[PDB]
Every structure is written in C-alpha cells, then in structure tokens.
Design a protein around this ligand. Structure first.
Ligand SMILES: C[C@@H]1O[C@@H](OCc2cnnn2CC=O)[C@@H](O)[C@H](O)[C@@H]1O
Ligand SMILES: C[C@@H]1O[C@@H](OCc2cnnn2CC=O)[C@@H](O)[C@H](O)[C@@H]1O
Ligand SMILES: C[C@@H]1O[C@@H](OCc2cnnn2CC=O)[C@@H](O)[C@H](O)[C@@H]1O
Ligand SMILES: C[C@@H]1O[C@@H](O)[C@@H](O)[C@H](O)[C@@H]1O
Ligand SMILES: [Ca+2]
Ligand SMILES: [Ca+2]
Ligand SMILES: [Ca+2]
Ligand SMILES: [Ca+2]
Ligand SMILES: [Ca+2]
Ligand SMILES: [Ca+2]
Ligand SMILES: [Ca+2]
Ligand SMILES: [Ca+2]
Lengths: 114, 114, 114, 114
C-alpha cells in the first residue's frame, strides 16, 4: 500500500520534524502539492533533529514525505493518529538497509499550530 | 484515565522532543522510574522546539510526561503507536487554556534509536 | 479531555461493534448527531461480541459512544487511527471498576464500508 | 514493509474478529508461532462479522494474519495502538482489487481479556 502520503485541511499551517538513526546520511524531502517545500540532510545514530519547519498545506492539502540515502529511496511505513478529536499526528518511518528497525529517518508531522 | 504514562522495554534508549503552541511559557518534565530525568521550557506560537534529548528507560521502563503552564498542570492526552511491529511512538498533547486545541505543548517519544 | 466523540465523514455508513470483558453487565450507547442510534448489552469475561451494527453518520457526521454498568457511566479512553490515508478506525475502551484494564466494554468503529 | 505481524505478551489470551466488505469471499488465517490457530471465511458488502474467536499467544507471542481471496494473497496494511498504557489494538486492512479501499477484509485483534 502507498505510504508517506497525507491529506491535510487546505491552507493550514503544520510542523514537520525529521530525526536520523543510521550510519548513512539521510535526505528527507517534504512535498506540498507535488512540489518540494522543505529539505533536510544529515547523519546521526543518536536521534538528532536534522530539521524542523513550519509549512502551509496550500490549496490541495496534499503532503508527501520521501526519504533517500545517497540517491537510493528508503522503504517507508506510515499512519495518522488523532487524539481527543482535535490533535493530529502524521508518522513516518524509513528503512535504508536490511535490519528492519525502520528508524533510519523518522518524520513527524503535527497540526494544528498556534 | 491516566495519560502521559508509558511502559517501555527495560534499559532502552529513547528520544524525547517538545514543541510549543501557546501565549504562555510551557514547562515539560520527563520522569523515569518516578524521578525527573529531563526538563524543557520555552514559549512559541509557531511550533518551535523547546527541547530535545536522549534518555535511558532504566530497569523499570516506566516513563511519564508532565506539563505545567502559568503555575498549573495542563490536561494531557496520549497514545502509543507501533508501525511494522518495530517502530514505536509515544505521543502527548496538552491544554493550558479554554480553547481545547491540545497543542499548547506537544511531546513526541520515539524508540528504538541507533 | 473529552473522549468517545468522533467527527466522521458526513452522510457516510460505518460499522460499530462492541466486546465485553467484565463480571458486570455492560450497556453501550451510540449517538449520531446527539440522538441515540444504537444500544448493545451483555455480560462476558471472554470478549463476546455483544452487538454489531451498520449506521449512517448523518448530515453533521458527529458520533458519540457512551458506556454504563448498572446505571453508572464508565470512564472512557479513545483515539482515531488512519491507515494508508484512507482506512479509519475509531477506538473506545471503558473502565467500570478499579483494576484499570479498560477492556470492560471495548467499542470499535470502522469506515468506509462496501 | 511487512504487515499483519504482531508480537503479543507470552501466554496471553486475545480476541480476533474479522469483517468483510467485498464481492469476493474472504479467507482469513490466524497463525500463532507460525502454525494455523484459526480460519474464517465469508462474503459481505455490509461489514458482516465473518468470524470471532479467543486464542492464546503461546510461548513466542508471535501472531500473524493472512488474507486471501480465491487463493490470491491480499495486500495488507496494519498498525498497533495502545490506550492508557493498558488496552491494545492490533488492526489489519486488506485489498483484493484495484480500488484501494483496503476494507475487503478488516481484522481487529484485542488484548487483554477478562
Ligand atoms: C548503524 C546502522 O546503520 C544502518 O545500516 C548501515 C547502513 C549505512 N548506510 N546504508 N546502510 C544500510 C545497509 O547497510 C541502518 O540500516 C541500521 O538500522 C543501523 O542504524
Ligand atoms: C471480572 C472483573 O469484572 C470487573 O470487576 C468487577 C465489577 C463487576 N461489576 N462492576 N465491577 C467493578 C467494581 O467491582 C472488571 O472491572 C474487571 O476488569 C474484571 O473484568
Ligand atoms: C464490491 C467491491 O468488491 C471488490 O471488487 C471486486 C472484486 C471481487 N473479487 N475480487 N475483486 C477485485 C477485482 O475486481 C473490492 O475490491 C471493492 O473494494 C468493493 O468492495
Ligand atoms: C495563543 C493562545 O495561547 C493560549 O491561550 C492557548 O491556550 C491557545 O491554544 C493559543 O495558543
Ligand atoms: Ca535500519
Ligand atoms: Ca537504524
Ligand atoms: Ca490551548
Ligand atoms: Ca495552542
Ligand atoms: Ca475493569
Ligand atoms: Ca475487564
Ligand atoms: Ca478493495
Ligand atoms: Ca471493499
């Protein structure tokens, strides 16, 4: 099934935050309406915040997360969870190798803000 | 029901990150085995990261998040999500006022690391 | 925080199903736009499916779950999970006593159907 | 990523329930420690319960759900959610066709019981 794709409410601010847990350099691209809106890069085996930004969902509300290591796309897992019918979390995990811990690049999207 | 309390696997390192979305200054305390292990503080209405840290779950694995604003504990909402039977997220939202957006302090715990 | 309340897609069919794990007789009420649409009841300590039904969410889409044992309201926990940006589960747990297993009446709401 | 595989606590009773939303007959296999423990089969486009049972997780705690339609394995989506650090849901969606509604056979695993 398709992973790493979420439909947010239109014209709404959201936060996007990436973590790294691998010996390979992670490249995280965040797409809004099929165009790159944010990009983060870095290497960590200690859960370093390789980037965090505030973006607008735009007219479409389509947000996609892609992860690659030196050009090679990582396998993705994702889900969305809503607490008390108000607070939203869009969660992404990625695997760049064989051990299947899926933490090599972890991406968290949260809304609403303010 | 009790919220913001999580049982992690014993002696496992986890990441903890806090965001702020309120007029008031947020104080986030992270407890391990019923003792304070980390404390974050700051103010933002733009989802700024007020703290991030790597901790150990210890012998018991019991981890608790508490949030205080303007001298009063915030109301908490929480849940744990596990993707592909490997990647764990422990999510916390909090409310300090009357609008019930529950984003005033957002806390994300993730494991395993490395 | 308010629990057991969910905003479903308007005018859409959903499935609601209840399980029982208590020595006390459970009563589950399902409200659609603030009016009782379904009621299930039973007594089992072995996860008996005391009721399953298909309902329409109506013009507003507001769905609420309430649980009571001998006329006393049970404490509720709830969350919504979305898989592959399409498949939805609204989950409810309830506690009628003091052991805090929160499984005394478990309610699962799923959509879309068909 | 692998889907439909869950690690439960050892020697623990759990409930497994399957729903159907497809013109094709759904066959659901539940494996405990890599051996078939339960099999459900049925057809519905109205979310009918095609089977429910209580099983023991055994010494390993490994539980796997498989879905097939007329011999053809369905693509699976899954996640585990824990409420108030006590109540566990293991959730499975499956797709047998081209529309990608992933509800053709829906499987809900819940624990603890009693
Ligand atoms: C330290 C390790 O780093 C990666 O493995 C090592 C690695 C480094 N670049 N690509 N890979 C995958 C193929 O070898 C990662 O997959 C593993 O979970 C650990 O975090
Ligand atoms: C068999 C037990 O049943 C309930 O407890 C016992 C019970 C029966 N009716 N109400 N109560 C709550 C006050 O005692 C329930 O809370 C507990 O988790 C077990 O499933
Ligand atoms: C009524 C429909 O039934 C299936 O489609 C029709 C069908 C019936 N058997 N296999 N397929 C897949 C290829 O045609 C299913 O995938 C779809 O979501 C609807 O529930
Ligand atoms: C700017 C406002 O500050 C406090 O009143 C919060 O309770 C609100 O959610 C909002 O963020
Ligand atoms: Ca890895
Ligand atoms: Ca890793
Ligand atoms: Ca607020
Ligand atoms: Ca706020
Ligand atoms: Ca109880
Ligand atoms: Ca019980
Ligand atoms: Ca389908
Ligand atoms: Ca279907």
């Amino acid at each position: 099934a398709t992973q790493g794709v979420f439909t947010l409410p239109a014209n709404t601010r959201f936060g996007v935050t990436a973590f790294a847990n691998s010996s390979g350099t992670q490249t995280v691209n965040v797409l809004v309406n099929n165009e790159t809106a944010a990009t983060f890069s870095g290497q960590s085996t200690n859960n370093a915040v390789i980037g965090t930004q505030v973006l607008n969902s735009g007219s479409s509300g389509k947000v996609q997360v892609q992860v690659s290591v030196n050009g090679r796309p990582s396998d993705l897992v994702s889900a969305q969870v809503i607490l008390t019918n108000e607070l939203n979390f869009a969660l992404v995990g990625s695997e760049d190798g064989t051990d299947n811990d899926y933490n090599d690049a972890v991406v968290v999207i949260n809304w609403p803000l303010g």
